[PDB]
Amino acid sequence: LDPLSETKCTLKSFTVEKGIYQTSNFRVQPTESIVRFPNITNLCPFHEVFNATTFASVYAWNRKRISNCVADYSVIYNFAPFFAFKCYGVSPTKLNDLCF
Amino acid sequence: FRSSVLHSTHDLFLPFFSNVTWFHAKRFDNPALPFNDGVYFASTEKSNIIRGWIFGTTLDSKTQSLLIVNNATNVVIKVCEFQFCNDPFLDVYMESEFRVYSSANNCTFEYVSQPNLREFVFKNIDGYFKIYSKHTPINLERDLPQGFSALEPLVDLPIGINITRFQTLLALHAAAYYVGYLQPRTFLLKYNENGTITDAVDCA
Amino acid sequence: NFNGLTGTGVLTESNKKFLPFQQFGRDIADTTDAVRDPQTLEILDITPCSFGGVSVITPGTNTSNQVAVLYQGVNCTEVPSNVFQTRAGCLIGAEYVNNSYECDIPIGAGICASYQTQSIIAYTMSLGAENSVAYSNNSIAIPTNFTISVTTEILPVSMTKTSVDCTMYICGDSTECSNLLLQYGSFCTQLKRALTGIAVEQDKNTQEVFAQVKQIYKTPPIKYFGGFNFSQILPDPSKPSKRSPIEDLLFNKVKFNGLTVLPPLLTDEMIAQYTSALLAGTITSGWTFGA
Amino acid sequence: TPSALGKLQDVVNHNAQALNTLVKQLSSKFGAISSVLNDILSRLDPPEAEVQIDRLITGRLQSLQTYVTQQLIRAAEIRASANLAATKMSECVLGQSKRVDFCGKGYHLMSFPQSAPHGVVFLHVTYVPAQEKNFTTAPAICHDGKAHFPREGVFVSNGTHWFVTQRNFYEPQIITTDNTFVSGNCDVVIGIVNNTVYDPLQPE
Amino acid sequence: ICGDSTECSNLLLQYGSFCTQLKRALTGIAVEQDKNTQEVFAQVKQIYKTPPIKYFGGFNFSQILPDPSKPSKRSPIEDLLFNKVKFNGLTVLPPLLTDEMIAQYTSALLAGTITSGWTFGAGPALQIPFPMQMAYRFNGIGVTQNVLYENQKLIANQFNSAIGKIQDSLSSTPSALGKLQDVVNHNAQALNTLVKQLSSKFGAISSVLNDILSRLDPPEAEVQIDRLITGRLQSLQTYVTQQLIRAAEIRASANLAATKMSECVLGQSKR
């Protein structure tokens, strides 16, 4: 309620005998979430995956390795109407907050 | 960053006054040295002679291997399952050579970023492959002059491959280098007001 | 959260000179106090925002209810009706007066508070009254009178001798728990021996303080010694325990969970008799019986 | 002024709160499920009850160790205080101490002991000077062509006459031979003045 | 122990009043350091002032008396002495008496001891010429009063040459003030030990609470967080015990200094 009340709670008594009693502490935290990572530059080549016209047949599906890059999965909603988007492994939407 | 403080850390350091192998320069002195927990590399080549480093355990296209060729213009760091024979060489013909390896299985990593006593430290721990470097000029006779030259971090790339041996290749058509072995010790580093290390003290 | 480095603090434009590879800055306490932005290469300093035990300056609830707080170690600009910036921290609830008085409630470096016209006020304590000694190479001052002043000094002598049972306090009338206590070694033996040593030490302290006399001296029937009245220190037979009025005031003004309190070896009557013997000796023998 | 006897009140309060805090930690729940043991052995399996109660033993054993350490520190402090009190008894009550501010504020004459709960109170009868008057002084006196110095006292002047009085009490005495010394001539004393020195042997 | 962690804060309440005893012990030391200075320097209640700068009996007190040239109002010896002697919840509290007030107490004691002798220790400060003041001190050690009067010019020269050598003695050889610097050295190294044990590894997967709370199961990681609470609370207990021991040592030293002031400065001692 007031400094006198927490002073009484610290001494565990309803009376005070004219002293300087250490009661509590103080802090401040109005904001957070400042710049974390540097310029995202080396994007993963999702252009030659979702925009490539020449796709191989299902019996001879292509195998393309994606590594050493930043996978901006937000571009999937651009190069395709995301009709049958279904993530069976981790999460459909929670995909940019984890790494492999 | 550290400003005018003394910091002691238990890490793989080169022991002071230890036993370091030297190769006093077609004479190349490449005996396919082994690779312990750390290799300290230093050279005094004339001009762009010692610009090759390979790593790996078995090297017979069965384990991951390293191939760092400077190409006189960049730092071509590529990780793949190369095939190294009993004697690699870089006898160009320009600035092109292929007889170093003969196969490439996966090639899962590539790094081609841009770059007279040159010093290097190659460490592999927790999957990462730490790389340090430092270039300081010398003018006296070739005797590894006494002093202090702190090595700055260069690449620090994560790979995760297994490395137990390493070899150095030179381009052909002085060539002296040093190979030191890092050991688990405890040093006492002194940093200046700008963060530059001035001297170290081996506690053992 | 610079590159994963989590923390909380103020970020100001730093004048440090890092190296191209360095990203963080540490002090001798292995604490990150300087950091660089990952996008822009500008260096920033990390300082702790605010923390300090707020001491509520209270003049006692028996007098009044107004209180004052003291945010120790922080300015008055980072706090959420008088506000004054003392060198010990921001003080809220008391104004600073220029007059200097005696230090009543210690507030910090040279600042003390008191309940005076009411409201709480802070000021610079006065070390004493100014007295210019009129020195001269031929001036002397000789006292023409005197004043017999009886001062009091209070010093503790002994503590309360206590002894605690190890197993009965830790577990208590238990068997499955007492078996695990045996695995802890002889820690129970150390505490008991330490408490017995403390008890015999308090007994020895009482003996060395009060039992300095070899015999017990008593005063003759009270008569006119020299005009001095010792009735305040001499015991009286009309009151039990044979304590003087001063000792009576001293005595008036000043379950077992495995722990017990041991009674003193010398009771309140034996110490009273030792004090009476010391007094009777020092009034009829002076410094002679002590030698 | 209840704060006067605060020295012994603090002792008894520390003796009380040390036992009250020790028994208050008995009802604690250090990383456990319940503070009492009957609700642990009769509710949890023996393989887990021995692990859960072991943390309660360490919490209560640490409380006993802290209690014993604090009691030892307080016993050392009280032993220092009791040694001081015994020395003060022997040097103020059993005699007269010349040590200033040891047996009261002023010139100690005698002291009286008084018994107190877990302590002792001394009554210091001190001699305090007061009501002083300023006078003119001189280091020596030149009467018979030679300097004179007071045996036990000081030389004071009320403006016209000179007298020798006690250093701590005002008692003017006529400067005579049995109250002054004789050493040296009247040339090395800085500030020596003239005055008559009486001699009871000359008229008789 | 926690450092802005809600899970640790609510869990620390189960350890009882261990935090209360540490704060009470640290506050008992704080009020002890202020009482020590009040018993050593705060001897007289009257702030005596030195007369205008002159000579008393040929003795040159320019090295111990305060000079109005410097703003700190400290004597040359005090200046030479002074010229060579918050993070992670650690807050250093300022002493009740500042260095300016301690200098004023010292100046008052000095003006009392050079203009009144030991008379200001038992009561009012009585005027007395410093030549014949030291003459009384010769009579106390068994030397007649006439020796000082016949060697006053020699006593003043030996005194002034000795006081002047004190500056050269305490200036060079910095090991002379080692007894007083070791106190702050021990305090600083104890604070460094207390702040460095925060990054310890008492058995948890990491030293930071965020690296453990985000990795392990919050309801399961309680038994591992408690392993760091005990490691950090025992460090605080060790720090408080060492501080209490050093406080007892400093209290003994301060009582010795108070006896020294009351007997050597406020009077003449035969011990």
Ligand SMILES: *[C@@H]1O[C@H](CO)[C@@H](O[C@@H]2O[C@H](CO)[C@@H](O[C@@H]3O[C@H](CO)[C@@H](O)[C@H](O)[C@@H]3O)[C@H](O)[C@H]2NC(C)=O)[C@H](O)[C@H]1NC(C)=O
């Ligand atoms: C990360 O990206 C930011 C934003 O693109 C970069 O900041 C920009 O860096 C450039 C190059 O140093 C600065 O210079 C020039 O500014 C003028 C305007 O005055 C502009 O017309 C030029 O095209 C050029 O950008 C630019 O001022 C600066 N802008 C900001 C807002 O900071 C930053 O350099 C990048 N960092 C890395 C390591 O790539």
Ligand SMILES: *[C@@H]1O[C@H](CO)[C@@H](O[C@@H]2O[C@H](CO)[C@@H](O[C@@H]3O[C@H](CO)[C@@H](O)[C@H](O)[C@@H]3O)[C@H](O)[C@H]2NC(C)=O)[C@H](O)[C@H]1NC(C)=O
């Ligand atoms: C590095 O060494 C090589 C040969 O050992 C030097 O020749 C250059 O080799 C690179 C590839 O290794 C060539 O880049 C290529 O460009 C084509 C487009 O023209 C692109 O489709 C390829 O994927 C590849 O990136 C480069 O053209 C070639 N230079 C010349 C003049 O033929 C090379 O100069 C050395 N230095 C560097 C910085 O590469």
Ligand SMILES: *[C@@H]1O[C@H](CO)[C@@H](O[C@@H]2O[C@H](CO)[C@@H](O)[C@H](O)[C@H]2NC(C)=O)[C@H](O)[C@H]1NC(C)=O
């Ligand atoms: C460094 O190691 C080499 C060998 O690894 C040492 O050379 C040997 O020296 C001993 C004498 O102590 C000889 O008996 C051996 O025959 C040498 N072996 C070889 C292969 O030459 C060399 O002494 C070591 N140096 C230091 C400073 O320890």
Ligand SMILES: *[C@@H]1O[C@H](CO)[C@@H](O[C@@H]2O[C@H](CO)[C@@H](O)[C@H](O)[C@H]2NC(C)=O)[C@H](O)[C@H]1NC(C)=O
């Ligand atoms: C640390 O960095 C500072 C800043 O660059 C260096 O100070 C410079 O020193 C040179 C050589 O003495 C001067 O020419 C410059 O004028 C200085 N800079 C400034 C801003 O005055 C300092 O020398 C560096 N420390 C070391 C040990 O090299």
Ligand SMILES: *[C@@H]1O[C@H](CO)[C@@H](O[C@@H]2O[C@H](CO)[C@@H](O)[C@H](O)[C@H]2NC(C)=O)[C@H](O)[C@H]1NC(C)=O
């Ligand atoms: C010594 O002093 C005490 C009190 O300080 C005297 O006791 C009082 O004596 C008067 C008689 O004049 C009584 O009216 C009071 O009731 C007494 N008070 C107490 C507390 O006993 C005592 O008489 C004095 N001694 C002498 C010899 O006169």
Ligand SMILES: *[C@@H]1O[C@H](CO)[C@@H](O[C@@H]2O[C@H](CO)[C@@H](O)[C@H](O)[C@H]2NC(C)=O)[C@H](O)[C@H]1NC(C)=O
């Ligand atoms: C200083 O003291 C002397 C000594 O007592 C004073 O002289 C006396 O004066 C009275 C007053 O007439 C005479 O009755 C005495 O016979 C004098 N005695 C002597 C020894 O001379 C003198 O008056 C005092 N002066 C002052 C200024 O107080």
Ligand SMILES: *[C@@H]1O[C@H](CO)[C@@H](O[C@@H]2O[C@H](CO)[C@@H](O)[C@H](O)[C@H]2NC(C)=O)[C@H](O)[C@H]1NC(C)=O
């Ligand atoms: C009073 O004191 C003065 C000063 O000490 C005496 O004057 C000195 O007398 C001696 C011997 O008579 C001379 O050798 C000195 O040269 C004198 N000094 C001065 C400064 O005059 C004086 O004799 C004393 N007695 C009287 C009656 O005056």
Ligand SMILES: *[C@@H]1O[C@H](CO)[C@@H](O[C@@H]2O[C@H](CO)[C@@H](O)[C@H](O)[C@H]2NC(C)=O)[C@H](O)[C@H]1NC(C)=O
């Ligand atoms: C006392 O001694 C000092 C030096 O030992 C003399 O010099 C003075 O020194 C102080 C600093 O301690 C300066 O503040 C003064 O300005 C100095 N004075 C002079 C004249 O140089 C000092 O003169 C001596 N005092 C006397 C009265 O002789």
Ligand SMILES: *[C@@H]1O[C@H](CO)[C@@H](O)[C@H](O)[C@H]1NC(C)=O
């Ligand atoms: C896909 O590639 C074509 C060229 O092959 C290009 O014109 C187009 O902008 C790319 N992106 C999309 C979304 O079509």
Ligand SMILES: *[C@@H]1O[C@H](CO)[C@@H](O)[C@H](O)[C@H]1NC(C)=O
């Ligand atoms: C893989 O690395 C380990 C070091 O941890 C080494 O002992 C082992 O021999 C390496 N494997 C091969 C095939 O060399």
Ligand SMILES: *[C@@H]1O[C@H](CO)[C@@H](O)[C@H](O)[C@H]1NC(C)=O
């Ligand atoms: C302080 O306490 C005393 C004793 O209980 C009481 O008589 C007095 O009235 C109190 N002060 C005030 C201002 O009420």
Ligand SMILES: *[C@@H]1O[C@H](CO)[C@@H](O)[C@H](O)[C@H]1NC(C)=O
């Ligand atoms: C604010 O804090 C700084 C830091 O100690 C201090 O120097 C200053 O006097 C304080 N007050 C103001 C008004 O800046």
Ligand SMILES: *[C@@H]1O[C@H](CO)[C@@H](O)[C@H](O)[C@H]1NC(C)=O
């Ligand atoms: C000395 O002081 C006492 C008490 O102050 C007083 O009773 C007495 O009359 C004084 N004597 C003289 C001579 O002034």
Ligand SMILES: *[C@@H]1O[C@H](CO)[C@@H](O)[C@H](O)[C@H]1NC(C)=O
């Ligand atoms: C000594 O004491 C007795 C008894 O009190 C008394 O009668 C006598 O007068 C005293 N002597 C003197 C000189 O006062």
Ligand SMILES: *[C@@H]1O[C@H](CO)[C@@H](O)[C@H](O)[C@H]1NC(C)=O
């Ligand atoms: C004492 O001082 C006063 C005031 O200065 C002065 O009038 C008086 O003469 C002095 N006493 C003596 C004995 O000189």
Ligand SMILES: *[C@@H]1O[C@H](CO)[C@@H](O)[C@H](O)[C@H]1NC(C)=O
């Ligand atoms: C006392 O000091 C004053 C002023 O310095 C001086 O005039 C006088 O001669 C001195 N007296 C003696 C006896 O030295």
